[PDB]
Structure formats: C-alpha cells, structure tokens
C-alpha cells in the first residue's frame, strides 16, 4: 500500500495520467528473507546470519 501510494504521488508529480498500478503474483518460488533491524541489532543479526 505504501509503495502504491508513493507511485501515485510520483504520477501526480509528473504530468502523465497513465496509470502504473501493480498487483501481487503469488508464485511457488521461495520468497526472499527480510529482516528489519535497529542499530542495536544490525551487527548482531549480520554476524548471526553470516
């Protein structure tokens, strides 16, 4: 939702009225691995998942 809102804000900033919406494609492939981390945990998580 945030990504779509940012894209819409960009489209408003630009002069093009052509939509550029996006939709989810649920494949069977393995999704990537995402870890939000604060500065108190970034080094810890990096050393752990090395």
């Amino acid at each position: 939702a945030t990504l779509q809102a940012r894209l819409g804000e960009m489209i408003a900033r630009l002069g093009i009225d052509v939509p550029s919406i996006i939709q989810v494609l649920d494949t069977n492939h393995t999704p990537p691995t995402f870890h939000r981390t604060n500065k108190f945990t970034a080094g810890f998580q990096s050393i752990c998942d090395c």
Partner: peptide
C-alpha cells in the same frame, strides 16, 4: 517488526515508457 521475516510478495510492474 521481524522475528525471522515478514510475509513478502512477488509483484510485477507494467509502466509507461515516458515515466
């Protein structure tokens, strides 16, 4: 927040040439 990960999605993009 992240214990191990969060549910993430595969998204396809179709965009105009100009923008």
């Amino acid at each position: 927040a992240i214990f191990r990960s969060a549910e993430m999605a595969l998204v396809q993009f179709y965009i105009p040439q100009e923008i």
